[PDB]
Design a protein around this motif. Structure first.
Motif, PDB file in Angstrom:
ATOM      1  N   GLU B 455      41.717  53.063  36.846  1.00 55.23           N
ATOM      2  CA  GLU B 455      41.191  51.746  36.478  1.00 55.23           C
ATOM      3  C   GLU B 455      39.916  51.480  37.278  1.00 55.23           C
ATOM      4  O   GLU B 455      39.968  51.147  38.464  1.00 55.23           O
ATOM      5  N   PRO B 458      37.000  48.298  33.458  1.00 55.69           N
ATOM      6  CA  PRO B 458      36.939  46.843  33.239  1.00 55.69           C
ATOM      7  C   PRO B 458      36.299  46.118  34.404  1.00 55.69           C
ATOM      8  O   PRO B 458      35.499  45.190  34.214  1.00 55.69           O
ATOM      9  N   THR B 461      32.411  46.711  34.183  1.00 59.46           N
ATOM     10  CA  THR B 461      31.778  45.978  33.094  1.00 59.46           C
ATOM     11  C   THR B 461      31.739  44.486  33.388  1.00 59.46           C
ATOM     12  O   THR B 461      30.705  43.833  33.194  1.00 59.46           O
ATOM     13  N   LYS B 462      32.849  43.927  33.875  1.00 57.73           N
ATOM     14  CA  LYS B 462      32.863  42.497  34.153  1.00 57.73           C
ATOM     15  C   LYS B 462      31.937  42.154  35.313  1.00 57.73           C
ATOM     16  O   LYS B 462      31.278  41.109  35.293  1.00 57.73           O
ATOM     17  N   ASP B 533      39.295  35.616  36.562  1.00 63.11           N
ATOM     18  CA  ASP B 533      39.901  35.523  35.238  1.00 63.11           C
ATOM     19  C   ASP B 533      40.952  34.423  35.181  1.00 63.11           C
ATOM     20  O   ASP B 533      40.995  33.650  34.213  1.00 63.11           O
TER      21      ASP B 533
END
Lengths: 468, 600, 18, 461
Positions: B455, B458, B461-462, B533
Motif C-alpha cells: 500500500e 493511494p 495520489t492523495k 479522510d
C-alpha cells in the motif's frame, strides 16, 4: 564511372578540434569521402568541407584522438559520398555510420545513391488528400494530418513525448473503413526510425515496444547513444531519409520516417560552425542552418506516376519551455504545423498532455468534408476551439477577481472546460478511438450549451444533428 | 624526443620542436616536470593544458615526452585514501615532506610499493586451463568490510602457466602469467587504465531496486533508482552539500565515492573528521564507514584544468568498482566549476564562444560524462552484476535556471530535484520545491513497492492532490482574505499545513531524526491521510444533514490529538524498536477513531 | 557585441598575413 | 644567492592601453617584476604578464603615462614578486604598494614570501569550533562567528557598516569562559579618506595600536595597484600566523573596487566576458583571496576574515554578492530599511546565515538549548513577517488571536533583541535569557520547533 587506383597523402598540418587541416593535396574534390589510418592501426572516415589551393580541411565523423602529424595516413577516393541501399534493409539495425551493430552481416547494397539525394521537381508532386487515422483524440478531429503531410512534435525535457511517438507509430491506420475491409487490410506502413542523441533507456523502450508490436518485418532502425562520437549526428538523418526515398519511390511502399531530437542536430552543426570560424548568427548558430533544415525537411509528399508516400514526424525539444528559441522558430518556418505538448497539463496528470490552443494543421483545409470524413466536421472544431479560448479567458478572470463576479454563462464555460479536459483530452495508453466516435464526443461536449450560445455553426447543421 | 618552450599564458603553454606529438598524450614541462596534456597541434608547434599553475616555467625549458595518455592505477589500498585531481595520495606527500604545503608537481607513486598483502588463489584455476579477459582469479582483503577482487584485464586471454600460491606478496611481486599465441606475459595486482576510455561491458539492464534515501522527502515523493541519474540545482545559501553528506553517510549501497570540484577544504574537514567516528554493521562486527568510502579532494585554490581530470578519474574509479560486481553511488559536487574551467581553457585558447561565453561542446561532453552509468551485467565467468548511479550538483549563476548548463543537465538527467531560495530562507530543511521537481522511475518501482509494502499508491495520489490543491488556493486565499471559503477548503489548507510542517520538515541533524526508515514514513502518511479522510466525511455528512462541523469546534475537540500528531516525529528509532513504533501508531489510530466516534 | 568584436579582430589579423 | 647580473632593454615595440610590448627580449621570465625609468627620471613598476617568442607583454601597476618608445628603459629581475614581511610592522602605516607613509623606513624584512602564496595541503587542516565573543546579540546567538571562518558583511552606500566593523574589532573576545588579543590587519581599497581617518581614530580608541598592521589606498591613487594590495596583506597575515603563533583578525573593505579594477584589466586584455561583463576568472581570483584562512595542525594560530563589500543597487542577484556568497559560508546583510527605521545595529536577521552552528555550539560549549531556541526564533520571525504582509491588506478585523500574538512578538523582537546600542557589550547568557523572555509570550503548545524535554525543562518560569 571511376576506374583509377586510389590516391594517398601523409602531409598533416594540424588538428583543430573535430577538424583536421592538411596541406599539399592535388586536384581535390569538394564534398569527398576520406579514410584515415592511425598510428595504432585503427580505421576512420571523414568529409572534405573546406578547399583552398593545395590545402584542404576535413571533419572526422568519429572525432580526433591519437592522430599524429606524420604517423597518420589519409586516402582520397575522389568521389562524392555514395551510400548503399536495398529493400533488404528492413528487419536490420545499424549505427549512425551505417555499420551493423545487431551482429548481422555487412550491408549488401542493391544500388548506390547520393547522400544529398536530388531536388525533386515540384510539378510531379501530388497534393495530399487522404486523411490518416491516428487513434489519438487530440490529433484526430482537431489537428488531424494527412498522408504525406509533414508535422513535428514540440516537447521538452521530462515530458512523456516518447510514448506519444510510440502510440502514433503503432496505431497507424486509414479512416476509409466505410468500404470493404478486405481491400482495407492490404495497406500497411513501413516505418524507418533514426535515433539521434538518444540515451540507452529510451532506445530500448522503443525497440521493446516495436518487438511487442511484432512489426520488424518492415522496421529499419538506426541507433545513436550519448557515448558515441558527436559528429556522426551530422550525417545520421540523411542516411535514413535517402533509404526512405528508395523504399518509397522505387519499392512503391508507404513509408513513415521518424526523426529524434533535432536540437541535437542543431547543436552538432553549431559545434562544427564554432570549429569553422564563420560568421555567427543569432545565438551563435550559423546563418545557413535554415537552408540545412530545409534540405532535411523537404523529402516528403508523394509523386506522380507512383503510389507511395512519405510523412515526416520529427520530435524536437524546446530548452526552458521557450517558443521564440531559434530552433523552434526556424522549424516553424519550415514545417507547416505545431502540437505543443505542455508541461502545465502534465503537472495535473493528463495523458497525452496536448495543448490544442497553440496547435495548427494548415492542410486540414481540404482533407475533410462530406465523403472524406463527414459532412459536418470543420465548424465543430472551430466552435469547440473558440469556446475553449473564451473559457480560458473566464478562468483567468476568475483568478483575477473571484467567482463572485462570474455570471451563469461563466459557470457554463468553466464546466465546459472541465468536461473538455476530462473526456476529449484524456484518452489512455491503448485507447484506439475512431473518427466517428470522436465526432460524436464533440457533439456530446457541445450539447451542454443550448442553441443560442453557439455562434460559429450553421443553423441548418444544428437543426440537422443537435436535436437527437 | 624533447621540445622547448615558446610561450605561456596562465594555464596554457605553446611549445616548439615537437613534431612527434599526439593529442591526449601525457607530457612533462619545466625543471619541476609539471604534468600536462596536448590539446592543439599545428606545424611543429603545439599547446599543452598544464595541470599546475605555471609561475616558474620560462622559454626554452625542456619538454619530455611519453607514449601513454592520461592514466590511473587500480588495486588494493585505494579504498580509504584521499586523492587529488591527478591521483596523488595526500598521506604519502604529508609523510614525505613533513610539511603543510604542496610542492609544485611532486613525483609520487599512486600506490605504495612497500606494503605486503595476503593473497588467496581462485581455487579452481590450474596451470594449463584457458581463461578469458574479465574473470576473477584472486581475492585480497583490504579490510574486514570489503574483499577486493582482481580480474584479468580486457584484451587479454590464453592459458595460464603459473599462479602465485597462497601467501603474502607486494605489488611488484608478479602473480599471474598467461600465453595465448606462444608468448609469455606477466601480470601484477595493479592495473594501468586510460581515463577517457569506457570500460567494456556485456549488456545493459534496467532498474529494479530502489536507492535508499535518508530523508522522508525525496523517497516517498521523488524517489531515485539504484543506478540512475539525479540532479540537484540550487542557489547559494541552501548549502546542498549537506544533503550530499547525508546521502553519503547513510545508504544501502556498498561503496561510496565523493569527488570535489572547486569547493572549500572545510567540506573535506567535516567528512574526514566525522566518518571515522561513524560506524555500522551488516552481518556481525562493526566497522567505521571510512573503510567503505574513497575521497577525491580538489579545492578551488588548486589549478583550473585539474578539475576536468578529477571528474574523469572519479568516473574511472567508480567504473572499476562497477566491474567488481557491486553497487556504487557517487555524488559529484559543483559541476558548474568544471563548466567554468572548460570555458576558461577555451577562451584562453581563443575559440569563438557559443552561448553565455561557454564553449560549443559543453552539452556533448556533459552527456557523455553522465552516460557512464546504469545497472549492467559484468563480463566474467563468476557472472557478477554491477551498478552505478550519479548525483550531480548544479550551481545556478545567481539562482537563474535559464542558464545553458542547467537546461542541458535537465535534458540529459532522468530525475530532477528543485531547490528554492525562499524555502531555505524559511530554515525548512530540506528545501524541496515539490512543484518543478519530478522523477521518471515511480513506474519501475511500483512492482517493488507492491511486492514488499502492498500500500503506497493511494497515499501518494492523495498527497499529490492535496499539495496541488493547496498550491492552487494559496494566492486565492491571499487575494480573498479567507472570507467566503467552504469548510472543505479550510480542512484542505490546514491539513496541508500539517503535512508541510511535520511530514516535509525534517531536521536531519537532531539525533532522533538523523535517519528515517520507509515503514515509519508510510505509517506517518497513513495516519495523516486517515485523519484527513475521516474529518472530511464527518464534516460533509454533518453539513449536509444539520449541525455543520466547522473547523473551530473540531479543532477544539482534537487540539490534543493534532498536537500528538505533530509531535509524533519525536521517536529516535535507534532508541525505539520498530515493533513499539508501529504499536504506538496503531494506538494513535484507534485514539483518533475513538474521538471521531465520540463526536458522532 | 563581444562576439562581433572577436570575429572582426580575427578578420583583421587574417588581413595582416602579409 | 642569485649571482646573475641584472639586464635592461630599451626595445619598446609598442604601448596599447595599460599594456607594453618589449621586443628582442632575451629568454623572458614569466610572472616577473620589472622597473621602469621614465625620461624625466620618475620610477615606475610592473609585472610581466605574457611571453611569446622574443616578445614580452607587461602590465604596469601604477598605469601607463608618459612612456616613450625611444627614451625609456626597462630592467629585469628574474624572480617572481616577493614582498617584505616583518613582525615589527605592527603599529605602522603604508600605502597600497607597501612604501611607508608615516616617514617610516624601509621595513627590515624578516623574509621574502611569494605574493601569490601557495595552497595548503588538504590533510593538514583542522576544523575550528571555538565561538567568538562579538558583543552583538544578532551575531552571538543567531549568526555566531567562530575562529577560522570568513564571514563577510553585505552593505550598500550610506549604511553604517563601518561602525559594525569598529564594534566587531573592538569587542572581540572568547565565549568559552591567560589573556587574549587579536592582531588587527586592515587594508583600504580606494575608499575615501574620511572613512580611513575614522578607522584610524577608532583604532587608537582601542588602545592597542601596537597590534594594528594597517595599509591604505585612496580613490585618487592609480586603480591597478588595488589588485596587489590585498594579496600583500594576506601574505603578512600568513607570516604572522604560521611563523609567530599569533591570531590575526584580518578585515578588508570595498571589494567592489577590487572587482572593478579586475574588470578594467580584463577589458584591456579582452578576455571572454561573463555575467554583466565580468571576467571569467574573477571566481578563481576571489578564491585565491578568500580560501587563504583557517588553522592547521601543529599551530595554535588561526586566520579570521571579515571582507566587507559594497552591494550596488541593493540587488542580491548582482554577480559580486552571488559569487562571494558561493565562495564563503556565511553572510550578515546589513539592511537599508532598518537604518531608515532609525534602529541600530541594523542587521536583518532573516537573510543572514552562518554554517558553523554544526560544531561551534552545543552541549559542553554553551548549552543544550541554544540551537532549538535559535530555530524557534527564526521560524517565529519568518511567520511574523508573513502575517504582517497579510495584515498589510486584510486588516486587523479579519485576523485571529494568533496573528495578533505574532505581531506583538515581532514588535518585541525588533524593539528589544535587535536594539543593542553602540558600547554595551553583552554576554551569551544574557542574550539567551532575553530570547527566552521574548519567547515566553507564546504558550508552549504552538512552539513546533522545540523538543518536549527542553520545553518542559526551561519554559515554566
Amino acid at each position: 564511372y571511376l576506374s583509377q587506383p586510389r590516391l594517398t597523402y601523409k602531409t598533416v598540418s594540424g588538428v583543430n578540434g573535430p577538424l583536421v587541416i592538411l596541406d599539399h593535396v592535388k586536384f581535390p574534390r569538394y564534398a569527398e569521402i576520406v579514410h584515415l589510418t592511425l598510428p595504432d592501426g585503427t580505421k576512420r572516415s571523414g568529409q572534405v568541407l573546406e578547399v583552398s589551393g593545395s590545402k584542404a580541411v576535413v571533419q572526422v565523423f568519429e572525432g580526433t584522438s591519437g592522430i599524429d602529424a606524420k604517423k597518420t595516413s589519409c586516402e582520397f577516393t575522389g568521389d562524392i559520398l555514395r551510400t548503399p541501399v536495398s529493400e533488404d534493409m528492413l528487419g536490420r539495425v545499424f549505427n549512425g555510420s551505417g555499420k551493423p551493430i545487431d551482429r548481422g552481416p555487412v550491408v549488401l547494397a542493391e544500388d548506390f545513391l547520393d547522400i544529398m539525394g536530388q531536388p525533386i521537381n515540384p510539378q510531379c508532386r501530388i497534393y495530399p488528400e487522404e486523411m490518416i487515422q491516428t487513434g489519438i483524440s487530440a490529433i484526430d478531429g482537431m489537428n488531424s494530418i494527412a498522408r504525406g503531410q509533414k508535422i513535428p512534435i514540440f516537447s521538452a525535457a521530462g515530458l512523456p513525448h516518447n510514448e506519444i511517438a510510440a502510440q502514433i507509430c503503432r496505431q497507424a491506420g486509414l479512416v476509409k473503413k466505410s468500404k470493404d475491409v478486405v481491400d482495407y487490410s492490404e495497406e500497411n506502413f513501413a516505418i524507418v526510425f533514426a535515433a539521434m542523441g538518444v540515451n540507452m533507456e529510451t532506445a530500448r523502450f522503443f525497440k521493446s515496444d516495436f518487438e511487442e508490436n511484432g512489426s520488424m518485418d518492415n522496421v529499419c532502425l538506426f541507433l545513436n547513444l550519448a557515448n558515441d562520437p558527436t559528429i556522426e549526428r551530422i550525417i545520421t538523418p540523411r542516411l535514413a531519409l535517402t533509404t526512405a526515398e528508395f523504399l518509397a519511390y522505387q519499392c512503391e511502399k508507404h513509408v513513415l520516417v521518424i526523426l529524434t531530437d533535432m536540437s541535437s542536430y542543431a547543436e552538432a552543426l553549431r559545434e562544427v560552425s564554432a570549429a569553422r570560424e564563420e560568421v555567427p548568427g543569432r545565438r551563435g548558430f550559423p546563418g545557413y542552418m535554415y537552408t540545412d533544415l530545409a534540405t532535411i525537411y523537404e523529402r516528403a509528399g508523394r509523386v506522380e506516376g507512383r503510389n507511395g508516400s512519405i510523412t515526416q514526424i520529427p520530435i524536437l525539444t524546446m530548452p526552458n519551455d521557450d517558443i521564440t528559441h531559434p530552433i523552434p522558430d526556424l522549424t516553424g518556418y519550415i514545417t507547416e504545423g505545431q502540437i505543443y505538448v505542455d508541461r502545465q497539463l502534465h503537472n495535473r496528470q493528463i495523458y497525452p498532455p496536448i495543448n490544442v490552443l497553440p496547435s495548427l494543421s494548415r492542410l486540414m483545409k481540404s482533407a475533410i468534408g462530406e465523403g472524406m470524413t463527414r459532412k459536418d466536421h470543420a465548424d465543430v472544431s472551430n466552435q469547440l476551439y473558440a469556446c475553449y479560448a473564451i473559457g480560458k479567458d473566464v478562468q483567468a478572470m476568475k483568478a483575477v477577481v473571484g467567482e463572485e463576479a462570474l455570471t451563469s454563462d461563466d459557470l457554463l464555460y468553466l464546466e465546459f472546460l472541465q468536461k473538455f479536459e476530462k473526456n476529449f483530452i484524456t484518452q489512455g495508453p491503448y485507447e484506439n478511438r475512431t473518427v466517428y466516435e470522436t465526432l460524436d464526443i464533440g457533439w456530446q461536449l457541445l450539447r451542454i450549451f443550448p442553441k443560442e450560445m453557439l455562434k460559429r455553426i450553421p443553423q441548418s447543421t444544428l437543426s440537422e444533428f443537435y436535436p437527437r | 624526443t624533447f621540445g622547448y618552450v615558446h610561450g605561456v599564458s596562465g594555464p596554457v603553454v605553446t611549445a616548439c620542436d615537437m613534431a612527434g606529438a599526439a593529442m591526449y598524450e601525457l607530457v612533462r614541462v619545466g625543471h619541476s616536470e609539471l604534468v600536462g596534456e596536448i590539446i592543439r597541434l599545428e606545424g611543429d608547434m603545439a599547446t599543452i593544458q598544464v595541470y599546475e599553475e605555471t609561475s616558474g616555467v620560462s622559454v626554452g625549458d625542456p619538454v619530455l615526452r611519453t607514449g601513454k595518455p592520461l592514466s590511473v592505477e587500480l588495486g588494493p589500498g585505494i579504498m580509504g585514501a584521499i586523492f587529488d585531481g591527478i591521483q596523488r595520495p595526500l598521506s604519502d606527500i604529508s609523510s614525505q615532506t613533513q610539511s603543510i604545503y604542496i610542492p609544485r608537481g611532486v613525483n609520487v607513486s599512486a600506490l605504495s610499493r612497500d606494503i605486503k598483502w595476503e593473497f588467496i588463489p581462485s581455487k579452481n584455476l590450474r596451470v594449463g586451463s584457458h581463461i578469458t579477459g574479465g574473470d576473477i582469479y584472486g581475492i585480497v582483503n583490504e579490510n574486514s568490510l570489503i574483499k577486493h577482487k582482481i580480474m584479468l584485464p580486457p584484451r587479454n586471454r590464453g592459458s595460464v602457466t603459473y599462479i602465485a600460491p597462497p601467501g603474502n606478496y607486494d605489488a611488484s611481486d608478479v602473480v599471474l602469467e598467461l600465453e595465448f599465441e606462444g608468448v609469455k606475459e606477466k601480470f601484477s595486482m595493479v592495473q594501468v587504465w586510460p581515463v577517457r576510455q569506457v570500460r567494456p561491458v556485456t549488456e545493459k539492464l534496467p532498474a529494479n531496486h530502489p536507492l535508499l534515501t535518508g530523508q522522508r522527502v525525496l523517497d516517498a515523493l521523488f524517489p531515485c533508482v539504484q543506478g540512475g541519474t539525479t540532479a540537484i540545482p540550487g542557489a547559494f545559501g541552501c548549502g546542498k552539500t549537506v544533503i550530499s553528506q547525508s546521502l553519503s553517510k547513510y545508504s544501502n549501497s556498498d561503496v561510496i565515492i565523493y569527488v570535489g570540484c572547486g569547493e572549500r577544504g572545510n567540506e573535506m574537514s567535516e567528512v574526514l573528521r566525522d566518518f571515522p567516528e561513524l560506524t555500522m554493521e551488516v552481518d556481525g562486527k562493526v566497522e567505521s564507514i571510512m573503510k567503505r568510502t574513497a575521497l577525491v579532494a580538489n579545492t578551488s585554490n588548486m589549478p583550473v584544468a585539474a578539475r576536468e581530470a578529477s571528474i574523469y578519474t572519479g568516473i574511472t574509479l567508480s567504473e572499476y568498482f562497477r566491474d567488481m560486481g557491486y553497487h556504487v553511488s557517487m555524488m559529484a559536487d559543483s559541476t558548474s566549476r568544471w563548466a567554468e574551467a572548460l570555458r576558461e581553457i577555451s577562451g584562453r585558447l581563443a575559440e569563438m564562444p557559443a552561448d553565455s561565453g561557454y564553449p560549443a561542446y559543453l552539452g556533448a561532453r556533459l552527456a557523455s560524462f553522465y552516460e557512464r552509468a546504469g545497472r549492467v551485467k559484468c563480463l566474467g565467468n563468476p557472472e557478477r552484476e554491477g551498478s552505478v548511479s550519479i548525483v550531480g550538483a548544479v550551481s545556478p549563476p545567481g539562482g537563474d535556471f535559464s542558464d545553458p548548463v542547467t537546461s542541458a543537465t535537465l535534458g540529459i538527467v532522468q530525475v530532477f530535484w528543485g531547490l528554492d531560495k525562499k524555502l531555505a530562507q524559511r530554515k525548512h530543511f530540506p528545501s524541496v520545491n515539490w512543484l518543478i521537481s519530478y522523477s521518471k522511475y515511480m513506474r519501475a518501482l511500483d512492482e517493488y513497492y507492491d511486492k514488499h509494502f502492498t500500500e503506497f499508491v493511494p497515499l501518494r495520489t492523495k498527497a499529490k492532490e492535496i499539495l496541488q490543491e493547496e498550491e492552487d488556493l494559496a494566492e486565492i486565499v491571499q487575494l480573498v482574505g479567507k472570507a467566503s471559503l467552504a469548510e472543505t477548503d479550510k480542512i484542505t489548507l490546514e491539513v496541508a499545513k500539517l503535512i508541510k510542517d511535520d511530514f516535509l520538515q525534517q531536521n536531519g541533524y537532531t539525533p532522533y531524526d538523523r535517519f528515517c526508515p520507509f515503514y515509519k514514513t508510510v505509517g506517518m502518511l497513513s495516519n495523516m491521510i486517515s485523519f484527513y479522510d475521516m474529518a472530511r466525511r464527518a464534516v460533509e455528512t454533518t453539513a449536509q444533514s444539520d449541525n455543520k462541523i466547522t473547523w473551530s469546534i473540531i479543532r477544539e475537540h482534537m487540539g490534543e490529538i493534532l498536537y500528538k500528531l505533530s509531535s509524533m516525529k519525536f521517536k529516535d528509532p535507534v532508541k525505539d524498536g520498530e515493533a513499539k513504533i508501529k504499536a504506538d501508531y496503531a494506538q494513535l489510530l484507534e485514539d483518533m477513531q475513538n474521538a471521531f466516534r465520540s463526536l458522532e | 557585441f563581444y562576439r562581433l568584436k572577436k570575429i572582426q579582430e580575427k578578420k583583421k589579423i587574417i588581413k595582416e598575413k602579409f
